[PDB]
Amino acid sequence: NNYRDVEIRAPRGNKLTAKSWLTEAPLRMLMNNLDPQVAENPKELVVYGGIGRAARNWECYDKIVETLTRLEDDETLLVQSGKPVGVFKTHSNAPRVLIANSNLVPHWANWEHFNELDAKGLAMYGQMTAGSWIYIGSQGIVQGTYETFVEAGRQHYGGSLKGKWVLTAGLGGMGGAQPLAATLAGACSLNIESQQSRIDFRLETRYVDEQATDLDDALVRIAKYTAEGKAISIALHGNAAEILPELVKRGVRPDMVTDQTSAHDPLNGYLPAGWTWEQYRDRAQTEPAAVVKAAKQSMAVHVQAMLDFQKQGVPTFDYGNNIRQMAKEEGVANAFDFPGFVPAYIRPLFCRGVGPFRWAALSGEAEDIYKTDAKVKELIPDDAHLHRWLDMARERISFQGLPARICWVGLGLRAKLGLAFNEMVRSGELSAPVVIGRDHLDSGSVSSPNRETEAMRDGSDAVSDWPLLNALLNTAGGATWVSLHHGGGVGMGFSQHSGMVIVCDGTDEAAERIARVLTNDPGTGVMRHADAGYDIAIDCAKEQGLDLPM
Amino acid sequence: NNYRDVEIRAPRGNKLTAKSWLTEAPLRMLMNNLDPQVAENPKELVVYGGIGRAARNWECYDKIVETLTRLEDDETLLVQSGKPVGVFKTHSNAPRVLIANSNLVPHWANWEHFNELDAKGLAMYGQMTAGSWIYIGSQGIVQGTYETFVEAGRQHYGGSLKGKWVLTAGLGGMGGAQPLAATLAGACSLNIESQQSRIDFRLETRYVDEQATDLDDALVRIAKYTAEGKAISIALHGNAAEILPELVKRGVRPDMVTDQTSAHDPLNGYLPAGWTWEQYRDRAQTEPAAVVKAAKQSMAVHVQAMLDFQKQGVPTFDYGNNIRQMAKEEGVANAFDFPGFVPAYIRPLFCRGVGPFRWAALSGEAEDIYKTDAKVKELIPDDAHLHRWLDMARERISFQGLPARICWVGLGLRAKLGLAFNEMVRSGELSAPVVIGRDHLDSGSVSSPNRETEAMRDGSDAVSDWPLLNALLNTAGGATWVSLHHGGGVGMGFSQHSGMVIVCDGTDEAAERIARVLTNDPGTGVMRHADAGYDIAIDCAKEQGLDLPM
Ligand SMILES: NC(=O)c1ccc[n+]([C@@H]2O[C@H](COP(=O)([O-])OP(=O)(O)OC[C@H]3O[C@@H](n4cnc5c(N)ncnc54)[C@H](O)[C@@H]3O)[C@@H](O)[C@H]2O)c1
Ligand SMILES: NC(=O)c1ccc[n+]([C@@H]2O[C@H](COP(=O)([O-])OP(=O)(O)OC[C@H]3O[C@@H](n4cnc5c(N)ncnc54)[C@H](O)[C@@H]3O)[C@@H](O)[C@H]2O)c1
């Protein structure tokens, strides 16, 4: 019921299995989430991010496909932690699917209780885009990581990073974007990863350039490439909790230090020092409580090394995996002496509603995305940073599963782009409808005190009204599917967030929904930051004519 | 800031202040929440249930009224912990208001952090119906309390409570329903209450019969009235944490024991033994941490007395204020040896979608409600228990603020009732539109392991996907306002829940919305309990033709 030896991929072209494009779309994107070229471990329904799954188990998968296939134009399917639990009458301008995954009443919102519920067949971890069917492989995060490194470069090094290098770890589905992101930002990088198969996946998808044979070889490569102003990513097979302390000991000074192991889930996502992956997985079923303690003890040593780098003047930051919290719980009292990437670097972008906006071509045709890329350039003719992004994406980002594009834009341009794409479907320029979504990391869709809402200027870090309002509003406006998840990114107890996806099928009805939903979705994030008192947000609100009563 | 010396009441009759009845309705219900005859402390914006407020502060109140008055028929107001934060374009079939109150990311979901935020002007406790504008005074809970006592009587005493008495505490807004509910179930009751003013309010609203002069006198009255087979409610001014242990010491044997003090909020809602309310309110400002400890210490003593009664064979239960949890935290390890009222008594009703369904006449006219009562009897001709409820309500429940009715009905009948009421508005039988709602305590709208989802047969107590899906579904189907709240009933950390209200303005468009909303809302509760594997819920789902894919 949790393992199936099948390769799944999204249906291609313009023939429908479901009754309409609005139901065909979630059917295709659920399948795309499990593409061998997209997902980390799809035979076990795992997309990314530890145990982030697409459906609760294989029986539930089958039933969701069957239900979407028959769903009428005025019906809405409810998905409850990856299970299709009910279908109810709404109307054609409401979402076809409403998804709520991994939500636990706060006092019980921890991995121990989640795992008890999972053993009873009652649980599924949605991560962010895993359980809400809008994962596009490593591309979904790569621009956000690039923008983080770019901003860190602007703050610390004068912008570009030629001759500099990043030290980090984690080459999973999302951590795998770190090497390429650093490269695109002009840095060399050393990326430690404990599973060879994960390094291979990154090499095969062009996300990492090369693999060193040991730490010494990695250091000779970094010294050489940085001296020559090359921007090349190196993988190193090993354990970050062993390597980072050793580098501190050798007096090695990276230009930036971060981490993107799956520290958010000690049982599943983080290899204790000295263990093989095989021992880790075997012991997780036998003695889970001991495994969690071992993993967190290693996280503590890992974080002290990051702290030690920072004490040497190295820009150090948390890249959103809750590792500081885990170290803090294990006695590293000053774990939060280095900041999260959002307060440090990315929040100003969120203040204008900018974030990991994305779209996918349901046709399966690369040229559909290239036509969107050209149309974005036409609609935003005077943003060279963004034109450069799309050029870098064309050159360096290989499609995984259905062709898709990441393109960070905010309030105003989201709706302009969506309406233009919908006109391109209408005219036949695009071969089939496109879907427009985003990560749940976005300006108005997440509350997460150790990540996206860390150190809000007004102290409102833990206020989670906002993502709940965002999902409610996306439903009222007519997103095609809308999601409310708990614990994405940072793990059980630490986040609540919303998702949205909307289908551009060329119709006038789609256009009226698009204009609303792609205004409102970034609008809520500009609102949320204006509420906190950010002048950049307030300014953007005024420019864009938001109605913010207070 | 939080105090204004004004008397607020809902506008009456057919003249609109706002632009339509869809926006006039929330405007009137917000004001009705603060009516001097309805609310516990409306000069401080407090409705019930400790510090359950209608708006965050008076500046926010003013702006909500101002905004509601101008809100257009295709706009939606977002309310974020009692603050009007944004207005966004949706459509006429979406809710006019979307409300999210008191939501905190789980690791921070506690009173200590809520109070930090409140001090900064960032918080408001919504309770259930306080911040979502559907409170109708003590009537909202009275049928639920009655059904609880009736079912306990059926389980332990062969049904009727004639010659029996209930011992309880708390005569606040919701606890004040206890005396009258016991009376209606045939029992006499002793009701202990620490504030004379609250006793007075219950006397003024005819929810309690008489006040004893002291404990000895109270017991004389209980002895007399039970011997005579009368059903009289007695208020006793004092502290439950003192009186219950004393009654145990005296060997006094009540026929059932419960509690409904505001134990869910140790800082504001529970008087420590020996203190006065005035000492309590002042010291909560100076020494909150010491006040909390003193309150919880008294709750431990109080719960131990409850446990001691139970050991003597007295039916004892928790009536939904989280007191067991507080006692357990203070070292009463067996605090949960007596059950909550929902697993003990009420869950079977929830399995058929039955719960605190209610409506209010925006006209202000008592005869509008009487006409609805007669319509319900016509549409449900063969349920004598329900006819008897409506007879008792007519005879013994006096209106507070806008005339309103509590009437517990479930899946199928809710929609039948709502469409009929909408017909009566259209025809002019009713003088003005009515609003249909409910408590957030309902089959499909709440997760609360120490209350509504305590001891779910499948262990799914903590799974909170369901209320979130209920809110999203109510939004998609066209409720007039929809709410998502945290911590209602049981306090910060212990619940998540949804609210809905829909306006019956006599239009065909309202009818289309009502038909599906009043199906879907109880439908989700039948779904939720069928998912948990309750045969009565599965049966109901089949009878009502629900589409439950699994
Ligand atoms: N900041 C963001 O914008 C953002 C976005 C998405 C995900 N995330 C978070 O990023 C983290 C990584 O996500 P993912 O999809 O790559 O996860 P994943 O589970 O697919 O991969 C994690 C990788 O970490 C490796 N690893 C674990 N322990 C290690 C150790 N001690 N030394 C070296 N490598 C080790 C594993 O081998 C695995 O390949 C997660 O915590 C996720 O929640 C952050
Ligand atoms: N079971 C349900 O269906 C349900 C529904 C609504 C509310 N509730 C809960 O019921 C409880 C009471 O709600 P309410 O609206 O009456 O609250 P309230 O705050 O208006 O009143 C609480 C009352 O308890 C009294 N009190 C506090 N400590 C006392 C003590 N030690 N001894 C005697 N009296 C004491 C106060 O004087 C006050 O009058 C809350 O916990 C609320 O969350 C339960």
Curated annotation (Swiss-Prot), chains A, B:
PANTHER family: UROCANATE HYDRATASE. Binds 1 NAD(+) per subunit. SUPFAM superfamilies: Urocanase. It comes from the Bacteria. Belongs to the urocanase family. It holds the Pfam family Urocanase_C. GO terms for molecular function: urocanate hydratase activity. Changing C540A: No loss of activity. It catalyses: 4-imidazolone-5-propanoate = trans-urocanate + H2O. Homodimer. One of its GO terms (cellular component) is cytoplasm. It is found in: Cytoplasm. Keywords: Cytoplasm, Histidine metabolism, Lyase, NAD. InterPro entries: Urocanase, Urocanase-like, Urocanase_C, Urocanase_central_sf, Urocanase_CS, Urocanase_N, Urocanase_Rossmann-like, Urocanase_sf. This is Urocanate hydratase. Its main location: cytoplasm. GO terms for biological process: L-histidine catabolic process to glutamate and formamide; L-histidine catabolic process to glutamate and formate. Its EC number is 4.2.1.49. NAD(+) binds at residues 49-50, 127, 173-175, 193-198, 239-240, 260-264, 270-271, 319-320, 451-452, 489. It comes from Pseudomonas putida. Pathway: Amino-acid degradation; L-histidine degradation into L-glutamate; N-formimidoyl-L-glutamate from L-histidine: step 2/3. It is an enzyme of class 4 (lyase).
